[PDB]
Symmetry: C4
Subunit: 241 residues, 4 copies
């Protein structure tokens, strides 16, 4: 709380600071689309590469400033950690030879989420449902795991591409979950060799489908139940009192 | 409010006027189906072309009359603006050389929506949900935008048809959203060259799917919550009073 | 109400009568599966053909008896009319030369629905939702109709199989509604010739999808609202009284 | 209740016993994944085969102990019966020559469900919805059965792979239910020979789809109705009393 501390603290926390960052993101966003065209890149490429290095500099300063202001409270904020790791990624230099990190640089456009509070509320809303499903996700994954193992050893030898490997079978089973080509592309070919392959995949399709629908039904109905508790208690004690 | 004004105002606003338009639309509707058959067109084509020019004349008169009656209130009515722009389109002549406008002429059948009030209520109902989703739509589109950029530069060089271009990648990503052939048609081919391509598309499939379902769940549950507020207040103050 | 009338009326209305019919249906049901195997048919075919003619005789008698008992009240009962028309179909003889009616004979197994009251309740439940959707169905069909006409004339000339005809276009548009191969099978081929074909089908996919989901959401939420009216009135007037 | 009985009864019922089993399952689970790699199997295969025989021994002892403790109450517990039949399967020796039972051995990983009570609650939750649907399932299956018979005899002769047989037709009809390639893969080929085949499959697609959605809607709305009964009674009699 020194006098130097509050100097920067009043900047960082200013609406102009936030607004300025958003301007940059929206600008670097448009810039990253244009960088997609080799035509544009041949003409104006050096400009954009610099604007890019400019922006990432600013964002590094910015993240350093917020760390001064917020201190340990910054590394316990998920939105700040995200901003951190996105900016960290952008710093690993293009010479790294692993172009994956060059492409991951686009994740900085997600600042337009962490910085706009109406976006934060949505993402928070969406994510909020997930912790109640962790056990169902675990059940589903165990299920996938068991069936991946059985598939690999029923079909891996004749169908190595689809089932030669735990991973390949996981992949194929996820594909059948989405029902994408599950019969013409997978199970019908399978059955020219394993005529009962349908006894594996149909029940797999039933379970996995039943569970997902039931997840959604339970979420709606159990929420409506809580809304009803809060209304019961209110009505019932405006009557008692 | 002159005496000439109300002369036409009583026509325009008459049930017979409305009924007459609907008759025409339903007639021009049947006519536009028959115009689809070259057989029919070879026999009776000139008849229909004229009936068509007739109807569009009437509709132009009609729209002019409603503008006299309603004045500035007409250009603040979305149903009137629609009727306007559909009739405007039909006026651009067949010589224009841009047959798109010739085909857009079919949109005049949508008068059967703007003119029948039971239809207006449905469309109004449906559209009513949209303004609350604008922020989610924006989040989704930003998401698509970020992933379109990463895809274009991970896969555009070897897969120009599916990913050579921001637009092509947008297209393909929408296709994967609907899950149409996402694995046999897209990701499996992709992985003969980029074995980890599944680390891109599966999480993309999870997010986009999770969000859409969660949109629907939130709409049902948040509405049921409002219905519960209005019932709380009623019950609670018939008790207080 | 004569003494002969009630003689048969007590049979027709007896539990044994109903039970007997169900036995027959379940028996003719098993029989119609076995008739599917040419092996079985070569061995036991003449037996089954007769059992079949037997059963349809009985059912004709049965339907005649119920008409005596129920009189005009029988032709105002949808379950009876169904039983009627299914038995009518079975009477048109195999010599007719239109094997469609030979196959429609299988519809008599649906007696196992019209005769078992737990089934009747389900089907009644399901059908009950439909009259409230008639206007939405009409909107959807008008929509399909307008888009079928535009598609036929944008794409019918180069793509006669998918769009050469109002009917063909209806078909294809229903296929795109279910999203079956809409992109790899239809729109991607289309775009090698009409690069903007995506401006037609994507918005078509949005509308048709939006509407169906919104139909379901409205049904759940509007029902929950009615359940809330009936509970309001009860609570509110046990308080008033 | 002898003194020897309670000796083992206190073990079986101990938290350490349960915990120990779970450790084993999670260990044999990891082991069954590694057994998937021929590389690993060539190096460490004999180890795993023994660990496997070890674990199944333990589980046999374990199941015998729980039978002593629980007696007839064990064969009326579905979770115990499952554990039983999974362990029974594992006992049939590898010499049996029916490798299906060798693969079914993986089902022992489902102990991680029967033994962890948070999992039991989920599966119990999910299964709980099913008994109310039995009649709808029956209606659906009758429906499939009737349509399988009609399809087999309309299309079995020209399309033996898809419809030559009651079973083949069942399969294909389930495929059309999931909408997987129903048009490009099935109905479009069908219509080059049977131009009206769409009069069969489209209504089939409507019914089967309508029913499934309606099942889900009814489940949500009928539950919300019960939640409303329990809240009515509470509110209404805190007012009466
Ligand atoms: C109602 C909820 C439903 C949730 C269902 C979840 C069930 C599990 C989903 C798994 C998805 C499919 C994963 C997959 O593709 O597996 C690949 C990997 C290893 O494969 P690998 O052999 O490297 O590569 C296969 C492709 N190839 C041969 C061309 C290189 O295989 C693995 O290594 C297995 C990875 C397991 C991932 C578990 C994901 C947890 C879900 C997170 C929750 C998100 C909520 C929004
Ligand atoms: C009862 C359950 C208890 C919990 C158990 C959870 C942990 C299980 C881990 C099992 C790990 C098994 C890994 C494995 O077998 O890898 C197989 C393959 C590699 O095959 P390999 O033949 O070694 O490749 C040789 C390559 N070459 C020729 C070039 C030399 O590589 C792959 O296929 C990739 C491996 C994907 C593993 C996916 C793991 C899913 C975890 C699910 C957890 C569920 C918890 C409830
Ligand atoms: C839960 C809500 C979910 C909403 C998700 C929305 C996410 C975004 C959907 C985008 C849909 C796909 C658009 C698409 O095809 O992109 C094409 C264009 C430019 O492509 P272009 O390169 O011209 O042509 C590609 C095809 N080709 C090469 C054969 C000519 O690409 C563009 O120019 C991008 C256009 C962006 C459109 C944004 C649409 C907003 C949705 C409206 C809300 C409707 C509610 C009923
Ligand atoms: C952090 C985000 C901030 C917000 C940013 C939103 C605005 C972004 C606009 C980016 C515009 C980039 C346009 C672009 O790169 O076009 C690429 C291609 C043309 O490639 P090009 O190589 O120029 O074609 C040469 C043709 N030749 C050979 C015959 C001479 O043409 C195409 O591929 C069509 C371009 C489709 C653009 C789709 C725009 C989606 C907007 C999403 C907005 C999300 C807001 C939350
Ligand atoms: C995990 C949840 C993520 C959710 C957000 C999505 C993030 C995006 C992940 C993107 C992964 C894309 C992987 C892929 O296959 O892309 C292609 C690259 C490069 O191909 P490469 O393997 O170099 O083969 C080149 C062959 N050649 C020379 C003949 C052309 O392949 C590679 O270089 C493989 C490298 C694997 C990277 C793994 C990245 C982990 C996720 C990123 C960090 C989280 C951000 C929130
Ligand atoms: C949320 C509700 C969604 C409802 C959406 C309904 C929208 C309309 C659905 C239409 C379905 C597709 C009909 C179709 O395939 O059209 C074929 C016919 C004439 O085709 P045609 O040229 O004879 O044959 C085409 C095939 N070919 C060339 C190989 C012989 O084309 C016609 O003749 C048109 C027939 C219009 C049928 C209208 C159906 C009303 C729906 C009934 C409600 C059921 C509720 C359970
Ligand atoms: C503003 C809307 C007002 C309401 C209008 C509703 C009534 C519309 C009826 C239109 C009837 C048009 C029939 C038509 O054009 O048929 C075209 C084709 C036959 O083509 P054609 O070239 O004659 O075949 C010649 C055969 N050859 C070479 C062997 C001699 O045959 C076909 O393609 C089959 C025709 C399918 C008709 C589907 C009708 C859907 C009704 C939707 C109603 C919506 C109400 C809200
Ligand atoms: C809203 C609820 C929706 C429920 C819808 C249920 C409707 C019926 C589903 C039937 C699923 C398809 C069964 C199927 O593939 O049929 C095959 C068998 C005999 O086929 P088969 O000729 O041996 O083999 C065909 C394949 N081939 C030629 C290559 C060897 O065909 C048969 O033998 C018939 C088997 C009937 C099974 C009935 C299943 C009851 C559902 C259980 C409820 C689960 C709830 C989680
Ligand atoms: C009104 C309804 C009353 C209830 C009726 C329920 C019971 C129906 C049972 C019917 C059994 C018919 C079995 C049948 O026809 O099998 C046909 C084929 C075998 O064909 P086949 O030509 O004998 O094979 C000869 C093989 N060869 C050349 C090597 C010598 O093999 C197959 O295709 C497999 C058979 C699949 C049977 C699926 C049964 C579904 C039950 C649905 C029950 C619904 C209850 C509400
Ligand atoms: C409308 C809602 C219905 C809902 C319940 C479903 C009822 C089932 C309808 C079945 C329609 C099947 C039509 C179809 O394409 O089947 C094939 C037949 C016969 O083929 P065909 O056209 O004779 O060509 C033979 C060519 N050859 C000599 C070289 C082999 O094709 C024909 O013979 C065409 C005949 C069209 C029959 C139209 C039937 C109307 C519906 C049945 C009455 C309602 C029952 C509730
Ligand atoms: C019952 C099922 C599956 C678990 C199981 O079946 N046991 C689980 C999975 C997701 C869970 C919901 C979400 O978490 C959101 C929310 C959190 C609140 O805090 C309490 C209410 C609510 C609606 C949760 C209720 C319930 O817990 C759900 C439906
Ligand atoms: C919560 C989510 C997403 C936004 C977010 O997560 N924040 C948004 C997206 C669509 C929104 C609904 C619709 O607009 C219809 C309706 C308008 C009323 O006026 C208020 C109630 C209701 C049900 C809205 C509630 C809520 O606002 C929803 C579910
Ligand atoms: C609002 C939408 C579309 C019409 C429109 O948007 N206007 C229509 C289509 C189907 C209609 C429901 C069903 O009929 C079943 C039921 C009949 C009862 O009698 C009244 C309640 C309920 C839930 C109906 C409410 C409402 O009418 C629905 C949702
Ligand atoms: C109405 C439909 C179809 C049967 C029909 O239409 N008749 C059937 C099929 C599944 C049934 C529900 C589930 O069983 C779960 C639960 C059991 C409780 O005990 C009572 C409440 C609830 C929600 C049931 C209500 C109703 O019974 C449902 C919706
Ligand atoms: O206590 C919080 C502090 O953590 C340290 O790691 C940093 O160097 C400081 O700048 C930060 O304020």
């Amino acid at each position: 709380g020194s006098h130097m501390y509050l100097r920067i603290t009043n900047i960082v926390e200013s609406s102009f600071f936030t607004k300025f960052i958003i301007y940059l993101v929206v600008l670097n966003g448009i810039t990253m689309g244009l960088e997609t065209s080799k035509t544009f890149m041949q003409s104006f490429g050096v400009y954009t590469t610099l604007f890019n290095q400019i922006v990432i500099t600013i964002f590094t300063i910015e993240i350093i400033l917020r760390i001064y202001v917020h201190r340990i409270s910054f590394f316990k904020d998920p939105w700040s950690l995200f901003d951190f790791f996105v900016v960290a990624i952008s710093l690993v230099p293009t010479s790294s030879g692993f172009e994956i990190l060059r492409v991951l640089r686009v994740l900085r456009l997600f600042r337009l989420v962490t910085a706009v509070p109406q976006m934060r509320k949505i993402v928070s809303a969406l994510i909020s449902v997930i912790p109640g499903m962790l056990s169902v996700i675990a059940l589903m994954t165990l299920f996938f795991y068991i069936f991946a193992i059985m598939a690999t050893q029923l079909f891996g030898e004749r169908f190595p591409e689809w089932f030669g490997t735990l991973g390949e079978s996981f992949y194929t089973l996820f594909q059948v979950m989405t029902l994408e080509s599950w019969s013409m592309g997978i199970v019908r070919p399978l059955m020219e060799v394993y005529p009962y392959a349908w006894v594996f995949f149909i029940p797999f399709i039933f379970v996995v489908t039943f569970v997902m629908i039931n997840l959604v039904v339970a979420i709606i109905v159990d929420a409506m139940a809580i809304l009803n508790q809060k209304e019961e208690q209110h009505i019932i004690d405006e009557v008692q009192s």
